[PDB]
Amino acid sequence: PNIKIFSGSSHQDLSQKIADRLGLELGKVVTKKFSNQETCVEIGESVRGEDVYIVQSGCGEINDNLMELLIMINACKIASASRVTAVIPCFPYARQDKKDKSRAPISAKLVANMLSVAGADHIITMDLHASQIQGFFDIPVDNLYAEPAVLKWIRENISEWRNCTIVSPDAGGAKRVTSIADRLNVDFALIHKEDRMVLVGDVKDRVAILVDDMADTCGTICHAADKLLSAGATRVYAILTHGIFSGPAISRINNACFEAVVVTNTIPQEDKMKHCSKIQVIDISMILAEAIRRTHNGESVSYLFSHVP
Amino acid sequence: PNIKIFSGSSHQDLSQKIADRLGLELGKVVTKKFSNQETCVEIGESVRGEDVYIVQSGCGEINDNLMELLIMINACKIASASRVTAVIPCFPYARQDKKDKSRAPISAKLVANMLSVAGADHIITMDLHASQIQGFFDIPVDNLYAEPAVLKWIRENISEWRNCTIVSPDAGGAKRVTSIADRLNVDFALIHKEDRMVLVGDVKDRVAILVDDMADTCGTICHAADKLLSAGATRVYAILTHGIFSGPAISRINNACFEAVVVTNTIPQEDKMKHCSKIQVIDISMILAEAIRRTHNGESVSYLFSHVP
Amino acid sequence: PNIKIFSGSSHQDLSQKIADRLGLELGKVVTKKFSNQETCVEIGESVRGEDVYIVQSGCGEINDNLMELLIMINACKIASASRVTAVIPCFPYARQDKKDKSRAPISAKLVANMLSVAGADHIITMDLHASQIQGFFDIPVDNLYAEPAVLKWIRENISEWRNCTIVSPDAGGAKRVTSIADRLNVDFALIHKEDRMVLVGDVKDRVAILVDDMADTCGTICHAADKLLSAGATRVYAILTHGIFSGPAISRINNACFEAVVVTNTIPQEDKMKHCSKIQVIDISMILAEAIRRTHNGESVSYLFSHVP
Amino acid sequence: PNIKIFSGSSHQDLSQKIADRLGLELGKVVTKKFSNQETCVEIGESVRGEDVYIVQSGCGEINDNLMELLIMINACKIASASRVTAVIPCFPYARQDKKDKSRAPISAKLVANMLSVAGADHIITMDLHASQIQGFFDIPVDNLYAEPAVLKWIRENISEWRNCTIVSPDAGGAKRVTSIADRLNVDFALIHKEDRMVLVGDVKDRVAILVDDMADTCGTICHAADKLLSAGATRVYAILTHGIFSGPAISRINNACFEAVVVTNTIPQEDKMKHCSKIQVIDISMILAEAIRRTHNGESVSYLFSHVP
Amino acid sequence: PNIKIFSGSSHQDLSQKIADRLGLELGKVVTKKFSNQETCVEIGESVRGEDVYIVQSGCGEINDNLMELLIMINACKIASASRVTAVIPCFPYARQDKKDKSRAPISAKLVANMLSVAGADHIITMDLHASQIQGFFDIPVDNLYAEPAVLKWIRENISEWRNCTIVSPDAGGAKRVTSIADRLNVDFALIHKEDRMVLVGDVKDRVAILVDDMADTCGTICHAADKLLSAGATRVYAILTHGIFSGPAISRINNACFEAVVVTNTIPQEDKMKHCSKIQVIDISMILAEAIRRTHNGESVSYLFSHVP
Amino acid sequence: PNIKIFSGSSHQDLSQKIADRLGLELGKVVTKKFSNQETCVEIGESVRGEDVYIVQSGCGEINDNLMELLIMINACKIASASRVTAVIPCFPYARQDKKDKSRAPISAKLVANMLSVAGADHIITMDLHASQIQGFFDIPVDNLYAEPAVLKWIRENISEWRNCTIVSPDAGGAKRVTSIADRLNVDFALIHKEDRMVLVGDVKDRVAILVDDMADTCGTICHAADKLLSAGATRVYAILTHGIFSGPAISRINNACFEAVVVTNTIPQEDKMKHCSKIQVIDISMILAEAIRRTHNGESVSYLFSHVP
């Protein structure tokens, strides 16, 4: 069985980068829409007995991309692929992970069920919003971390990183920032709202680094940056693995006081970078390519949790 | 257990009509989008131990409506509804029912699987494109027919209906037109392409009635009407249960020679009727309401196959 | 994993031919009946870690053959075969594919479910009655076509095939005859009943070729041939992939006006050819052997759709 | 929900008796064969929201009856019956319950899986060959015992029953005969082969009563009776819940030395009683009717294990 | 269908209290061990057609209690109970909800799968460690909150509760304490370690109230109380819904500086209260009884989230 | 894929022996308990793409061992092992294989379901209490026999084995002793209770050999030995594949009249052999190692049924 890399419509640049780092060409697939807005998927090459990897991120027009992904998975499954893996850098509906005193659907579980019934045997994703989403599946799920690439960017871009601070925008981000701080050996502050917020950890004359999993409307990071500047921090950085940047996000970032908003390219950012000069992008295509290659060859994937390939 | 009728965003008028004919109010549900194009569903009333019916048609923005439908089904299922029924007047991806020498997905089967895994116990649909789609499910599926309402419209709108002709636009429509002709006791012609088409059945000075399950781009009915006028038919009618009317459909119908294009309101048509004066709408909300009420009360549903309620 | 070919009792000649074209011996299996009409299956050789193919056609005593097939599949599955494929040249209950205004079971879906629960991982079949039956399974199904062999027979047996006609006995056979006509570049007529039938397409002094998927009682092809001779066609041919030939079929064919009734050997025909001199048999064992070999080696199976091996 | 009793073709007399004892008419169902030996099932009445019980015994042409039963179950399930129960007085393939050093299928497990996937929610059966077959299902299975009716027959037919003996034909029948002996307060002998057999338990001048679950070829009971007459027993009785009586059974019983071979009517015996004057039949239709009625009303079914209704 | 309440061995007092508040007697069940440490479960009364609720908490000898619970669920399911609900006040293995850079099992998902395959249709639990565990099931899960009873205890036991503080022992407890503070309208502090910890929120001369979901070894609450006394708080309270109190917990609490450690009786505490004078118990049996009664009657269960019954 | 052998806590000696005979080291796994009696499992090496075999016997603290086994299976399954096999020398809850007129759970079926849902693809076990337990699974189950090793021990330890007797303690053990006798060509006696028991088969001055599948409380073998000494047998032997030896077993064996109680090491016996001088142990680790190696290499496993490796 050989590796076949297929791209959805959501993130073609990421898929091309991944295929480049594996020494492959993207698989021949036509993904369009009929006139009635129905997804049309045609696998243009035989995938019989192959190790198929479909790259599709939960971004853009989310329901359309998810439908395309499910249809591609099912097409490869009934075309007798030996194994079908969904490479989903940003997991759709990941924030619908709990009910919490509401008659709300756990939409992430529904997405996991639909991926399972489409025929996915393996999920590769990056920085799941909640790790418990791994339990929503009955198939193996590899949850990669952008932390190696984030630390690399911090070291090569913040000259004052030995005295800097790693700040979480909310309580739920504590573990990630603590890990980052430990690997950098730096002090780590915290922030949480009460319309007011409290920041704990000395930041005066010290660079603050907000680290968080995603920014959708950027209310969280903007409030955090406001408070960080209240406490007299010199410069403020925001680092995110998923730059959804929906709605008022670009205007808020433009009107905010960040020195940089760094995001990983799990979501295409070219358009967002057009209208916001302070957005920078970390390439994580090497981590995804390495994970695909290690799952194919049966090598350890947890090695990546601590090493940049 | 009491009937609860919930509407999706796709066809709110149809749901309101159905709820009216059942003497009910639509269930309290909020269906919106987050900023990142993610479906948000909130059931505003308890459905515990109730007989929930969700009305949503595979029209408009199809993937968005299907995702909303699945999310609503799952929300009602994990909110402890006794039974959840998906009322899907136009089944999405119904035309993806077969592979036919292509590495194509059978998307209709995938939709059936997703409806099953969301937790639907019953499907009510109208004029499935292929009856074999009933076999795609492991739950009961009630496939209603618009034929009663179609015959009623023909009798009350075509004064020459005793001498008229019932014509199929393609080979695959033969059974429906034969049934219509038998119930009307009329001659039935046929049409099939060869860029040329052949029409069999005397139509000169006789009204032709094209009857078909759906019109998406209206190429089929337009070519059929062209040939019918070649054979000297006096007036031409098109009757359809699903008026998708996507892409060039409205321009083609406006430039065509139909005396009327009649469709059933399984899909909202107000916007299409705005730009096409020859589209008429048959109400089928009574058939849907009667089917919902008969499934709830345990009465025979196959009774509707031959009787207008 | 090596190929293991096992034969059921239904079609031993076809299985022997397939094993010959693969350079193999039929697997050692004892398939008998106990005194109480219960199927006894004993695999006489280890199938552990092997690629098992069971050849059994939905013919003869259909329920007995289907039970034998399911029992063999389950026996090979719990004997730790790596993969079990059911090679079913004529699919049993394929005509029970829809409900259609009746409280009828979709027996084809039930057969698919039973094949899945017995443990089949792959289905190879020839000319399914409805392509939507592929959607009845959640495993891959390869639906081979007899069209290559049919065209070969037509070219090597009908000297007037460049001016001939390809006729469908009913509406539902349109696609197959159109494909045959296109590959032969000939005119294609059509036939459908109204006790009367209408034939469209010039056939005078031209050979008519009825092409259809199966003949059970041969009422369809006999009525079609009657009408074709009404329209003054010189000679009439019937070509079928499945020659069930049950009940009054042999008498009807003997009393009919066919120049030949050609069938493919998906069903044993020796006994039927004994009592009907006009039945000819096309060997399709090469297509089945090639499909088995290509699924085993991971080569493209859709290649066969257009090429005789 | 009301009780609906449907009969298969296998045992129409038993179904009529059961329906009589419930004060019902048999449900309107047409069960025939097409010309190609395919089972045709048509439910002639609505079963929507009803409590359907299908009576079909694993006798006669076993695969045909099992296919008819599965098709009826599936038909009632997709016709929206509230609950479908398979009343299977003699379970087909029950003797294929284990592998035992052979590459043999556990056909009973396959039958259980097929009954589950057809949609059966409940199984009612009588004197399963192995009680572990109850574990083959994931649905509830009620395994009734003929012991009450057997004791009633013994008391009303063997005037010497207080001094009689209850003998098992093999080792595997020990539990049943011990229970019978305990409820009668009699001595219980045993028999097992070594071509020779040994009988333990004084039987001279005492009536021996062979008790066993089934007689297929009657080799077991005939050898047991031979040995019992070797040990000087006065008269020999055989009592069985399932009289399959296949192959040489009738000749063996006619040439044997039984005073009576008593069987319960889980299998039709009219034809067998025609050619064997020593076969008597115990009616167990009251136990089946009582079990159906108690499962419908939610009353205790285990009550029947000790009481004749 | 009537309510049947069955008790496991884990928490018999809680089950008796629940049955008292429902006006019922505990169902007749024998739960013992064979000599080989195997769980023996015998339902002593018919549960056919009943609404069975099994009360068993993930406490004590956890694997033994979980096995007993699964065996009871399966026993009631194959005894034809209409519906089986597992009332699990403390969910076993709830802390194994994620992998987090380790080759660790998500044991909570495994427990959910085993509960589903045993046949549970409904789960009632109290204060799940992670709300995402609700997504581990495909059946409805009601996750009750002890917050109403906790607020009642605070108001009736801390006379200074209008000026008090609600403190979280770690970051992951933020939401619960914020909700408690909002319903009390009090300031809410926070605590998190760095061997050092930082407390944010003025506590001098103010009572601190640690609120957390569980205390296993009481390291978390003991460190939090140490820091709270470092910041000069007058008195310190710990409130917990699950008092596991394993290992060194009792010694730590005895050597700590709590004014009270309040726990809810989801776990039996009589033995722990024997050796620790500062443990108090909040009865939550009324919430569990009300939830059972509301699920049985189809009334709203989410009503309890805000109201003490 | 390479063989990985993992040991549970139940039988570490057996796992080490098996790993020795395969030329491997035991896989690196930490299996402990948290303070709250919760199983903690950590796979210390990557199992990605490997053939994992977990050795764990249903002995000792049975529920704890079973939970550890399920947790290990699930851990290896979601760690992307190619195939996971549970090597279960003594199957837990195997004696709960039937209901038999009681509202008892079929706990063996529940254990099979839990093993399946944890993700086991293959079961290797030795001398299942009932062979029908193989039907409780839908995955392949290899049921090895200790008979080869038992015959080897008998021949090398009982000098009078050509004139000896093979005795079954109950009726249900008949098949095993008959097979042993046939392979030894010896007379075979039988024993069954009536507080009295009857022994059939001449044993005077002849060594009796009780052969049975397990001894839990040793009541069965002790009563059998008492009767055998009543019939004047010279010496009495008991041979068992599973020496559970729970409760009063050791005292009964010490007070009994066995010349030897031989057991196979499917359960650790060091502690039991400490307090009972007449217990001897047959090593069966070679059979288990050979079965593991043959399933890995795809060689015939049924070969072992008749040959000592």
Ligand SMILES: O=P(O)(O)OC[C@H]1O[C@H](OP(=O)(O)OP(=O)(O)O)[C@H](O)[C@@H]1O
């Ligand atoms: O739309 P924005 O203002 O950019 O906010 C996006 C936030 O949503 C998520 O947090 P969530 O609110 O789910 O809290 P949690 O991380 O504690 O679950 C995520 O951690 C971001 O912080």
Ligand SMILES: O=P(O)(O)OC[C@H]1O[C@H](OP(=O)(O)OP(=O)(O)O)[C@H](O)[C@@H]1O
């Ligand atoms: O987009 P339009 O030009 O309006 O055509 C829509 C057609 O699609 C379907 O037919 P299909 O082509 O699937 O053939 P079938 O009905 O024979 O399956 C349907 O019956 C309509 O005739």
Ligand SMILES: O=P(O)(O)OC[C@H]1O[C@H](OP(=O)(O)OP(=O)(O)O)[C@H](O)[C@@H]1O
């Ligand atoms: O028993 P016979 O007279 O030989 O007829 C057999 C016919 O049955 C099938 O057609 P069907 O009637 O199912 O129509 P369809 O092909 O349009 O579905 C098949 O296409 C044959 O034409």
Ligand SMILES: O=P(O)(O)OC[C@H]1O[C@H](OP(=O)(O)OP(=O)(O)O)[C@H](O)[C@@H]1O
């Ligand atoms: O065909 P016949 O000669 O009438 O024999 C039928 C026998 O088959 C069954 O026993 P089986 O041989 O399965 O042994 P068991 O009851 O110990 O499993 C049953 O108990 C009958 O005794």
Ligand SMILES: O=P(O)(O)OC[C@H]1O[C@H](OP(=O)(O)OP(=O)(O)O)[C@H](O)[C@@H]1O
């Ligand atoms: O054994 P103890 O010292 O009493 O600690 C028990 C802690 O475990 C859980 O927290 P966890 O460590 O899982 O963190 P989380 O709540 O943030 O997930 C829980 O919230 C308790 O605080």
Ligand SMILES: O=P(O)(O)OC[C@H]1O[C@H](OP(=O)(O)OP(=O)(O)O)[C@H](O)[C@@H]1O
């Ligand atoms: O606890 P002990 O006194 O050692 O008895 C253990 C007995 O249990 C099993 O027999 P069972 O009673 O299940 O009868 P069966 O073998 O006929 O099923 C097994 O065959 C042993 O003989």
Ligand SMILES: [Mg+2]
């Ligand atoms: Mg969140």
Ligand SMILES: [Mg+2]
């Ligand atoms: Mg957050």
Ligand SMILES: [Mg+2]
């Ligand atoms: Mg079509």
Ligand SMILES: [Mg+2]
């Ligand atoms: Mg059409």
Ligand SMILES: [Mg+2]
């Ligand atoms: Mg047809």
Ligand SMILES: [Mg+2]
């Ligand atoms: Mg046809």
Ligand SMILES: [Mg+2]
């Ligand atoms: Mg038997």
Ligand SMILES: [Mg+2]
């Ligand atoms: Mg027997």
Ligand SMILES: [Mg+2]
């Ligand atoms: Mg935690």
Ligand SMILES: [Mg+2]
């Ligand atoms: Mg915590």
